[PDB]
Amino acid sequence: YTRVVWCAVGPEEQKKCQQWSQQSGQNVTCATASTTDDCIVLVLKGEADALNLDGGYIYTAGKCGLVPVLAENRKSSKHSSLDCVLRPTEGYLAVAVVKKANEGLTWNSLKDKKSCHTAVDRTAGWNIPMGLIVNQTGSCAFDEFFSQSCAPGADPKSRLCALCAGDDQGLDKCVPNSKEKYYGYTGAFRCLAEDVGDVAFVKNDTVWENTNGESTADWAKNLKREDFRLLCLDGTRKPVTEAQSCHLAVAPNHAVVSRSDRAAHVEQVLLHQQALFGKNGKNCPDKFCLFKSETKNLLFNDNTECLAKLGGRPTYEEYLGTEYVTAIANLKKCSLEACAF
Numbered sequence: 223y224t225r226v227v228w229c230a231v232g233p234e235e236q237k238k239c240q241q242w243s244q245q246s247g248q249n250v251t252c253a254t255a256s257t258t259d260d261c262i263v264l265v266l267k268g269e270a271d272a273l274n275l276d277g278g279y280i281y282t283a284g285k286c287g288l289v290p291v292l293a294e295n296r297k298s299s300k301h302s303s304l305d306c307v308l309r310p311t312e313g314y315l316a317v318a319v320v321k322k323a324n325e326g327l328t329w330n331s332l333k334d335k336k337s338c339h340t341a342v343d344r345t346a347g348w349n350i351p352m353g354l355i356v357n358q359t360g361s362c363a364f365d366e367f368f369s370q371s372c373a374p375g376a377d378p379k380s381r382l383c384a385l386c387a388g389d390d391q392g393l394d395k396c397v398p399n400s401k402e403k404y405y406g407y408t409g410a411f412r413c414l415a416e417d418v419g420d421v422a423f424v425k426n427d428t429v430w431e432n433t434n435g436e437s438t439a440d441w442a443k444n445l446k447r448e449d450f451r452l453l454c455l456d457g458t459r460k461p462v463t464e465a466q467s468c469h470l471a472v473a474p475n476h477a478v479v480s481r482s483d484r485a486a487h488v489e490q491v492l493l494h495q496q497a498l499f500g501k502n503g504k505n506c507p508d509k510f511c512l513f514k515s516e517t518k519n520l521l522f523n524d525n526t527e528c529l530a531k532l533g534g535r536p537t538y539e540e541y542l543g544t545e546y547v548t549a550i551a552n553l554k555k556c557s558l559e560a561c562a563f
């Protein structure tokens with residue numbers, strides 16, 4: 223009962239979880255699902271306790287009663303005096319990236335180019351970029367804006383899945399979990415890295431993390447930031463250092479969600495867990511680090527300083543904010559009081 227059940231999405235996270243489970247003398251245990259949605263279901267049922275989510279899935283979750291608990295927080299130059307765990311969360315920039323070498327490509331010349339998405343329903347990989355394209359286009363036929371794409375979660379037999387590749391054998395094509403080569407921030411960015419697609423929808427941290435020898439993965443080894451460009455809304459191309467003035471929007475940090483009749487207990491065990499395998503714990507670098515997955519953002523993003531406390535005891539709408547909630551609303555009608563299960 224001081225014991226928490228985590229929901230691991232996919233085989234790779236199942237493995238980083240069972241590892242965490244050992245180091246905890248099992249104050250943590252794992253449930254496994256092949257997709258984030260099933261993970262949400264397991265939690266509803268009470269068969270699992272929590273998982274960390276991109277704001278896109280939180281929205282879904284909140285309709286079915288789960289609640290924000292703790293948020294991922296990364297390093298800041300403002301809000302420095304404050305400890306991490308109490309520090310306000312800053313959010314992240316949803317950017318759109320292209321290869322510099324690919325001149326002329328602009329936000330205005332994207333109809334029919336090739337896209338790389340983190341997955342369906344996520345914030346920077348989907349709901350932000352598609353909400354805009356649907357919204358400037360007057361259409362809902364957004365499945366027809368990109369001749370070809372990789373968008374984990376969409377129907378395999380569709381064009382949206384044409385650009386994806388499955389694990390080592392080209393099995394599990396387009397599944398919305400890391401087993402897919404082009405799944406999530408890094409997959410999506412590799413997708414452009416290797417010139418599979420013309421554009422990629424990821425967060426800003428992603429470009430910086432896999433370039434100029436930061437990633438050490440063989441596909442990111444020789445990647446050099448200057449070879450990339452951000453596409454702005456005013457149809458302009460700025461270096462990746464201008465993220466602040468050339469972003470599509472800022473997004474709510476991913477966060478741990480749970481059931482309300484559970485929140486308090488997930489929180490308590492977690493801060494303790496965080497104190498031990500977190501950024502400066504009795505056992506991170508020696509025995510086990512909760513935020514190290516090796517450039518693969520397994521369970522938590524790899525750039526998490528710590529899981530922060532919230533503040534006003536958010537209800538997800540507030541946690542996600544009225545801007546974002548609407549962006550998601552006008553978009554899902556193209557498919558409002560709800561759940562989704």
Ligand SMILES: *[C@@H]1O[C@H](CO)[C@@H](O[C@@H]2O[C@H](CO)[C@@H](O[C@H]3O[C@H](CO)[C@@H](O[C@@H]4O[C@H](CO)[C@@H](O)[C@H](O)[C@@H]4O)[C@H](O)[C@@H]3O)[C@H](O)[C@H]2NC(C)=O)[C@H](O)[C@H]1NC(C)=O
Pocket residue numbers: 297298299315426427428430431436464465466525
């Ligand atoms: C886009 O997203 C990127 C990725 O998150 C942001 O870039 C990072 O910004 C941080 C603060 O804004 C930089 O962080 C600090 O803390 C570290 C150490 O505590 C400092 O130094 C390290 O020094 C060694 C030796 O040179 C190197 O290994 C490291 O690369 C680092 O330089 C650093 O001085 C700073 O005080 C962080 O370094 C930086 N990360 C990278 C890879 O550049 C970026 O701000 C964000 N942009 C926007 C507009 O939001």
Ligand SMILES: *[C@H]1O[C@H](CO)[C@@H](O[C@@H]2O[C@H](CO)[C@@H](O[C@@H]3O[C@H](CO)[C@@H](O)[C@H](O)[C@@H]3O)[C@H](O)[C@H]2NC(C)=O)[C@H](O)[C@H]1NC(C)=O
Pocket residue numbers: 349350352353354357544545548549552
């Ligand atoms: C494209 O679809 C709609 C069309 O407008 C966009 O939503 C609009 O977003 C703005 C800002 O969220 C809303 O304005 C707000 O009004 C409220 C009162 O309702 C006020 O409290 C706020 O201060 C703010 O000014 C506007 O009402 C809203 N309209 C609708 C119908 O949602 C949507 O965001 C667009 N999608 C994207 C991705 O840009």
Ligand SMILES: *[C@@H]1O[C@H](CO)[C@@H](O)[C@H](O)[C@H]1NC(C)=O
Pocket residue numbers: 224245246247249494498
């Ligand atoms: C297991 O939980 C109890 C309660 O906090 C605690 O005594 C102990 O530190 C935990 N063990 C580990 C390895 O976290």
Ligand SMILES: OC1[C@@H](O)OC[C@H](O)[C@H]1O
Pocket residue numbers: 539540541542543544545
């Ligand atoms: O709910 C909100 C919040 O908590 O932060 C500022 C926002 O703009 C908003 O919509």
Ligand SMILES: [Fe+3]
Pocket residue numbers: 276277344345346473476
């Ligand atoms: Fe995200």
Ligand SMILES: [Zn+2]
Pocket residue numbers: 469470471472
């Ligand atoms: Zn802005």
Ligand SMILES: [Zn+2]
Pocket residue numbers: 534535536537540
């Ligand atoms: Zn409130």
